Design a protein around this ligand. Sequence first.
Ligand code: ADP
Ligand code: ADP
Ligand code: ADP
Ligand code: MG
Ligand code: MG
Ligand code: MG
Lengths: 371, 371, 371, 162, 162
Amino acid sequence: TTALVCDNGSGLVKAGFAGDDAPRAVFPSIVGRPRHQGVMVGMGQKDSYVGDEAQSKRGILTLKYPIEHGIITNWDDMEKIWHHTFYNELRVAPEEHPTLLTEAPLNPKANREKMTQIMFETFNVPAMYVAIQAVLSLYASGRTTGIVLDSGDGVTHNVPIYEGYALPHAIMRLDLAGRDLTDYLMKILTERGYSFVTTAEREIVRDIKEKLCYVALDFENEMATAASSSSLEKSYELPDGQVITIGNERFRCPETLFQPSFIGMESAGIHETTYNSIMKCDIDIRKDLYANNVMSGGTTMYPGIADRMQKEITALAPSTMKIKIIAPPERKYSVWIGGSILASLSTFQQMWITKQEYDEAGPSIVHRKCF
Amino acid sequence: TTALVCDNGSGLVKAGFAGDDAPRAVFPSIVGRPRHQGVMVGMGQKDSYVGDEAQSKRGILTLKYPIEHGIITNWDDMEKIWHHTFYNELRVAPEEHPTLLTEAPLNPKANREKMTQIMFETFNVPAMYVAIQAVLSLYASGRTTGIVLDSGDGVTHNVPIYEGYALPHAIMRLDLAGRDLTDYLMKILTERGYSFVTTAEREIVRDIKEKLCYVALDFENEMATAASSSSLEKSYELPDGQVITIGNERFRCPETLFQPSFIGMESAGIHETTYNSIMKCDIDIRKDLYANNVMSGGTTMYPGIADRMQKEITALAPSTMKIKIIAPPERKYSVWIGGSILASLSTFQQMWITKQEYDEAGPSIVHRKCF
Amino acid sequence: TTALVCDNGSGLVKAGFAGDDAPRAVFPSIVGRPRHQGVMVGMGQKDSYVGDEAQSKRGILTLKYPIEHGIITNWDDMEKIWHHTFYNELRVAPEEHPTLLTEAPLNPKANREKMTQIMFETFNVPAMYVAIQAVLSLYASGRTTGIVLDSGDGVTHNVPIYEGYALPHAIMRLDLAGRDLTDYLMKILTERGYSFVTTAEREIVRDIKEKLCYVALDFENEMATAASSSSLEKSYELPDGQVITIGNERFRCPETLFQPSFIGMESAGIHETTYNSIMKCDIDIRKDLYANNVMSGGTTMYPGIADRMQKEITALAPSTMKIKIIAPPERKYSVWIGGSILASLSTFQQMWITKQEYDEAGPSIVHRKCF
Amino acid sequence: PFSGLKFKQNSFLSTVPSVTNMHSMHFDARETFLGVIRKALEPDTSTPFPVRRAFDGLRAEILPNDTIKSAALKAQCSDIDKHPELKAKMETLKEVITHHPQKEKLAEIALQFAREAGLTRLKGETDYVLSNVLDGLIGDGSWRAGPAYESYLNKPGVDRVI
Amino acid sequence: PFSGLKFKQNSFLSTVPSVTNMHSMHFDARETFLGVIRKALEPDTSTPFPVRRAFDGLRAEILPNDTIKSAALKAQCSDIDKHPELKAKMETLKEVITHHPQKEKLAEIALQFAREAGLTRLKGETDYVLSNVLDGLIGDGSWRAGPAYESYLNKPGVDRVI
Ligand SMILES: Nc1ncnc2c1ncn2[C@@H]1O[C@H](COP(=O)(O)OP(=O)(O)O)[C@@H](O)[C@H]1O
Ligand SMILES: Nc1ncnc2c1ncn2[C@@H]1O[C@H](COP(=O)(O)OP(=O)(O)O)[C@@H](O)[C@H]1O
Ligand SMILES: Nc1ncnc2c1ncn2[C@@H]1O[C@H](COP(=O)(O)OP(=O)(O)O)[C@@H](O)[C@H]1O
Ligand SMILES: [Mg+2]
Ligand SMILES: [Mg+2]
Ligand SMILES: [Mg+2]
């Protein structure tokens, strides 16, 4: 009867039932094959771990992600992770409950067409629906207008939207996200000698990143604090026991969101592609978009990210009028929670994609369901 | 029907049936030719004693070992000792029961290829299997993870292994073992004048070693106890009757395991090649290898060896996290007992090397059976 | 007046004057303490041999390298080797000639900061400069564009660079190199019983490696030639006199460059991290990087290494367009020769790091000199 | 018959396991080699739709994902004469993988699974899928003999060397 | 005073020579024990800079590298009262090596250099550096007596045994 909502996270698959406040189970989107001998006779089974059991056993696995840049690449593994959601951790029959997949805007069509074809012809769900990420996040705001800095693990994107109506031409999207943060953090740990090489260490780099890295309010003046390096450094215990420490590399890594030339991609920062999105929008809406900026996605859980972009968009906006940065304390789950709302609306049960209308339509039916 | 398991010990051949708790017969791996006149007419037969009858009659024999450094050298004598196992002391027909030979890692290929060719084309056993030493010893632990300080009579080696999966590149192996202890004990008895020269006396040096020698907790501070030589010395009755005594040479001999420069080999001690093995392993496993260190093999029956390496690896590990030394009271037989388990598993009877698949394969079949 | 260029080789220190075609003196980067009694009275002096005199006298020394993985570890010994360069074999006053140290990319900062602090405050050179390895190697090419497979003794790395301009984010670097070849060759000689244990034998393993080991064109089909082992084996005389022979282990050792899972490191091979570097580069340059691949460094003196990677990158590239592998016959000295050019340019004498600008700057001056 | 269809390059490099992995005794090399061939034959999205879902539709009854479907697949491989319509559709896929653009890189790795993992330990008695897929990549089909030999014993000189 | 400073673990294991090496008669145990203490006190790069180059700057006039500087160092050790400013800076380093995190592993090896190499053959007449560095590692300073005894003659039984 009830619906399931399962945000296909680029880094962390978030899932749960409709109308629930918190998502039921959140596990990292990691499938992993083992890579060693296995001279034991009993424990050599289960030749592909996925999810949390791949997370704990990460030392003997080649951890690979099925989704990169918001684009689902390895469809063989992507079945394996969805089978882990429904059966292994939600323990629900997928043939009984309707689902609601979510995806980024401006991804390829085959990322959407295969995703519905692998949903019906494999899992036999009754009805599905595909939602744009950031337009779910306004339902989490409980507010019907304003652009969204939805920065995930794999992609960041801005979906400007006035009350009801979106701006499809002004949707901007950058591939710089948490993996591009993690890969750049791996580059700058080598300057302090902490050479973290392979995928098991690429996991523990993210544990360094999510526990330590903050973004600076003023980059140069706080870099000068790291010159007189007195109180900047913290220190992190690795899983083996030996401890690291990190100085200016702690805040220099999340400046990739603002200077994308650090990883060498030629783009504007997410403070500027914010303003470049609002300049693309029509002139009446611009007063309301400046008062309504929703930070969303797990990348935007950096401390100081709201105080930075409120300063930095103010540098780009005409200073005669106010800016606001709506950064709720549930930004990590905002796409799910707004997804949990939208499936629960009584005006929505005609907006699904049912199987009985799929069978004469084929996989192109989702292109005539909210583009 | 039942299988035999016969650990080709470098010093003591341990053998018995599958599923038995204790090995059936343990005898030293000594073949010996006589070396004198034999002017008696009746007792001049049996021109090559082997095993316990060579042990009791050791005064008129040139006792030689067929296996040195874990490598089987004299294949003519190695037939003679295996014929003594099956017929003379186990009294079983080798053509009826499957066998399970065991061997050290990183030994030469021809030590394995000849060993299977001399098993089928001489003894005609139905099926055989060759196991790495230390991976049997975890079956004796009943635990699926942790490195093993498997120090035998001829070789010591570390096989680090996480749950199921081994680390083949991190297998380390040192040739320092009980014979290198015995040969160094012969060098330092001459400092007290106890000149033990030939192979019969080399046997009774080992009886001195296994009954007296303990390893010190702190080498220098307990050496200083031997300066005020009051209670350190014990005394040992030789087989002729005259008695010896031994002071600082009692604990200075098993320090060769920790300072291999005493016998002049340029290596790290077995406390350090432990840590050098775990540093080679990946960073997640290192927390579990430190909690799981299995002492194994008859050399590690020295009293105080567990209290020493628990102290000494703690000096090398990062001190923020715990170490454990799993030293069971059956370390002398741990390779056999784990070998007795592995042959008894119901999931193992497809893992043998049968004769009917040998005949089209030749002796290279064991290289495609667990390397 | 003239400048010195001294490539701090991870295995072989290459040194000489600026503008010279060949480096003046090449000696292995080995310092060695003796390890025995020295009961002679006269010859007991010179308690630390270094260089060629440690090479000839290698039987009584513990040969240790000061640099591992391109990172200078033992700074006490690293003074001793540089003092051997300037005084003992170049016979030049370091206070008169400017120097030019070279180093790998992505090494730690303290490998660079200490290296300049130990250059001025110990040797008092007038001016120094630190260069990335592979960007010197294009000067040896006489060509301003193309990536470089600069594989040394201690580290391999790719520095993609278009005409003038480098790609700092696309610099990739793997620690697999000639010592990881040598250590794996020591592992696979034990399969033929040739147990070479300590550092003197680790030296003669490299003499086996550099004289015999070739890399195969097609690994599996040429492995099948070793099944019908007829003409593959050569044979090498050890320094004592006894001779070895080697079969499939001759080409299986340099396949570690292509299958890094042989030494168990989880990485792509150097054929693939080549292509992974060029995919990181921007799309216009990719046509020119494929036509310009410079093999460099002494590890790439394997016969057949050019014919292999030209085949293997062709398997990864889109086949519609050509590949080239620029493998000159001076790849062993290419970093020095390009270093000899760069110091000789008339447009370079303002690019040094002088002492008079060092004194108000401190050791962080090299971070504002080409990163 | 499947014209206008293509694949993306290097689509299978993440799927091929390490060599120390495939030296496992609990490594059933069939369903992980097919899992390479499954990923390697993933059709690129640049192919048009009506040739895409037909070739994908041929796959799901030939190269399934679940370990029970491929185990069910081997069941009719014992009596492949009595199942003609699936047996006849297999050589179509054999024709497709013959014209695969990375055939040599497949055929290099395809018999790398044969030796290190022991995929071809039956050598003439392997079932119908592993037969012709290898025969799709290896043209002459000379994989019957050759991985078994390993040059066991030869001593052209002195004894143990110390 | 040197707070926020640390070292890497096991930094000196390559430096400590073999026991057969230190049983040499041409083994001047001073400059090779200091060379262990030099390497063992190598500051880890995780320490910040302004405490790093000061502690390194204290070292170069205390633990030099050249064999002529340490031989010059012993020259003022005969009249250490007449050189206060270097004598006063020595106990700072003695305070540092007191709080060394591998003190016990140093203090185990520090008197291993004392017996096997004969480092402390003066026992009260050693100069100022070898005095307090050993006193930095050995707290009570009980290294004066004890390495000299070796339990020469005792025969609690029979004669030569053959
Ligand atoms: N509390 C936190 N502090 C800092 N960084 C975080 C935090 N939580 C998550 N992140 C970063 O955000 C990323 C999670 O992105 P996420 O929003 O889950 O992607 P997706 O939207 O595709 O699921 C991770 O890479 C993580 O490093
Ligand atoms: N109880 C003991 N105390 C001291 N040393 C022992 C003891 N038992 C065995 N040893 C030593 O261990 C060696 C036996 O090791 P063993 O278990 O036979 O190795 P392997 O089985 O691999 O040959 C003998 O050389 C003996 O000196
Ligand atoms: N002719 C050769 N054939 C094969 N290998 C070689 C040859 N010459 C050198 N090598 C390998 O290359 C290494 C030398 O590399 P080197 O020039 O020292 O790199 P770097 O200078 O960057 O350290 C040696 O250790 C050796 O193993
Ligand atoms: Mg998320
Ligand atoms: Mg044994
Ligand atoms: Mg080089």
